């Protein structure tokens, strides 16, 4: 049985990210800002951790065994570390991104969303509207797979949705996230910017 908040504002993040709890206020000093959708065994997260030390990164997986594995994995990383902050910005929870994203994240909360080696649909014309909701204007969707068909599927829906625009190969070659993606345990990549919403005042 999944655990998820009644609203994003009811979500207690101080248990997953205890290092960013203000001891005085009892408040969070930081918010989750990067999301790994289908994080699997947590590799991409591990590599993102030191690359984005100012950012809270959350992985989501639906498989229970896999999430328990990852919890233990990061707990270890945290204790096997010298500094008082090593891997403190990274964590996972068991959850269904296709359904409850808006329970966890406020509107425009995330800067980045990763879908790396998705299982041959978390990408759908219909699901994209919900992702657009939690991803800020200017935020990006990162995509890597070894399945050509899967890559072309992801590309077609992202490009057809009015709220997403593909980033150029030149952009990818300069982006650190793309490098980290390409180096996480025949690789087709696509990235997309979350376009600003047309003003309906």
């Amino acid at each position: 049985q999944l655990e998820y908040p009644v609203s994003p504002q009811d979500m207690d993040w101080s248990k997953l990210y205890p290092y960013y709890k203000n001891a005085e206020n009892g408040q969070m000093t930081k918010k989750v800002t990067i999301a790994d959708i289908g994080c699997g065994f947590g590799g991409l997260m591990i590599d993102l951790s030191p690359a984005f030390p100012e950012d809270l990164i959350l992985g989501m997986e639906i498989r229970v065994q896999v999430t328990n594995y990852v919890e233990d994995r990061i707990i270890a990383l945290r204790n096997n570390t010298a500094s008082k902050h090593g891997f403190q910005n990274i964590n996972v929870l068991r959850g269904n991104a296709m359904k409850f994203l808006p329970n966890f994240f406020e509107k425009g909360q995330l800067s980045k969303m990763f879908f790396c080696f998705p299982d041959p649909r978390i990408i759908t014309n219909t699901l994209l509207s919900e992702y657009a909701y939690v991803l800020k204007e200017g935020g990006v969707v990162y995509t890597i797979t070894d399945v050509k068909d899967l890559h072309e599927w992801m590309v077609k829906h992202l490009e057809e949705h009015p709220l997403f625009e593909r980033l150029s190969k030149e952009w990818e070659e300069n982006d650190e996230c793309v490098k980290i993606m390409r180096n996480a345990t025949d690789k087709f990549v696509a990235c997309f910017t979350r376009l600003p919403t047309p003003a309906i005042l």
């Binding site: 009644v6 609203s7 269904n96 296709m98 359904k99 329970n103 699901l127 657009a132 949705h161």
Partner: protein, 374 residues
């Protein structure tokens, strides 16, 4: 020999036309006060497995009537002859891959919003020719089961579609720009079964929760909640055994008066709250109305509520199929119109006899309690 209970009523704007769902059929009746009911036709769906009919809706000009057929996963469109002996003529059947669950007609009065069992929402132009094989993508979607749809409009004429689901969500999207989610209303701990839209961005929602929720939907703010637990408790029976589990089945608004009615599934009452004129969103109990059977449907025509009852197990002469509740200005209270109701029972009995389909064994009656399954 028992007559299949009525699943729903739909009253035309003037009140002279009433439509009823029984099993896979729609009966039309013409009405003139005081209490004259004339049978005006029977349409039957000619396509375990229950051929449900649901969601009767009249276009704005009342030229046509639409509904959903489960047998067919279709949107039925009927032509409505206000003069004919048989009032309904089935003229179209728009088929879908998953069965429609809720519908709403667009402002244009020609576009129908269909929300299906699987979470997708389609639009259909009822003027268009039914495509033999259905070929168009959802306009938007949830990954949970869809519970209700309402097209809605802000002051500037901007359209929004509100969809609710089995996973406690109330989503507000731009229409026709459905790729843009406006917001969600957060608060429900349990599935949401019913929404009704009020004045000045007031919205009311209910379902598995212990409370009725009030929102300003432009603001997105939850104005307040009304706890009805200490009211239906006495009405709960061993059909609420799952350990106490109950759910609002429908919440609906009077058209001009500041009143809202709803019913909890498998109880024998409807509860009527008053909407505060002083502070928007504030609710207070106004009245509870009890009936000889479980309420099975709840509807409103102007400032009257109609109710339909599960009278499967009466004895001798089968009575109490429906009730018409009217507001009494003198008494400052809602009261059943027994004459009009009783004559209706009479008109029902004689409209339906002969039909071996509608009058049948008690176990050959479609399941009548379907909101608890969420």
């Amino acid at each position: 020999s028992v007559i299949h209970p009525l699943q729903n009523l739909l009253t035309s704007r003037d009140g002279s036309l009433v439509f009823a769902i029984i099993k896979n059929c729609i009966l039309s009746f013409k009405y003139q006060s005081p209490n004259h009911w004339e049978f005006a036709g029977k349409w039957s769906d000619d396509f375990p497995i229950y051929s449900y009919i649901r969601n009767l809706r009249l276009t704005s000009d009342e030229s046509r009537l639409i509904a959903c057929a489960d047998s067919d996963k279709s949107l039925l469109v009927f032509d409505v002859d206000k003069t004919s002996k048989n009032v309904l003529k089935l003229r179209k059947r728009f088929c879908f891959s998953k069965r429609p669950n809720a519908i709403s007609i667009a402002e244009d009065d020609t576009t129908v919003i269909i929300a299906d069992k699987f979470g997708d929402v389609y639009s259909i132009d009822i003027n268009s020719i039914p495509e033999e094989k259905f070929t168009q993508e959802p306009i938007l979607g949830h990954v949970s089961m869809l519970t209700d749809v309402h097209l809605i409009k802000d002051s500037d004429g901007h359209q929004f579609i509100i969809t609710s689901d089995r996973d406690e969500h109330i989503k507000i999207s731009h229409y026709p720009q459905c790729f843009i989610v406006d917001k969600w209303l957060f608060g429900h701990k349990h599935f949401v079964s019913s929404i009704c839209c009020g004045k000045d961005y007031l919205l009311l929602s209910a379902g598995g929760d212990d409370k009725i929720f009030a929102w300003d939907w432009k603001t997105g703010k939850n104005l307040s909640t009304f706890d009805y637990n200490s009211l239906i408790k006495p009405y709960l029976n061993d059909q609420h055994l799952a350990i106490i589990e109950f759910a609002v089945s429908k919440i609906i608004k009077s058209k001009n008066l500041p009143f809202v009615a709803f019913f909890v599934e498998a109880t024998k009452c409807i509860i009527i709250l008053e909407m505060s004129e002083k502070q928007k969103g504030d609710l207070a109990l106004k009245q509870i109305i009890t009936f000889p059977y479980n309420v099975i449907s709840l509807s409103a025509h102007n400032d009257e509520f109609q109710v339909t009852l599960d009278n499967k197990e009466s004895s001798g002469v089968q009575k109490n199929f429906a009730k018409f509740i009217e507001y009494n200005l003198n008494e400052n209270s809602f009261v059943v119109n027994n004459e009009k109701s009783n004559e209706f029972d009479s008109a029902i009995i004689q409209s339906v006899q002969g039909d071996s389909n509608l009058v049948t064994k008690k176990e050959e009656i479609y399941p009548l309690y379907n909101v608890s399954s969420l």
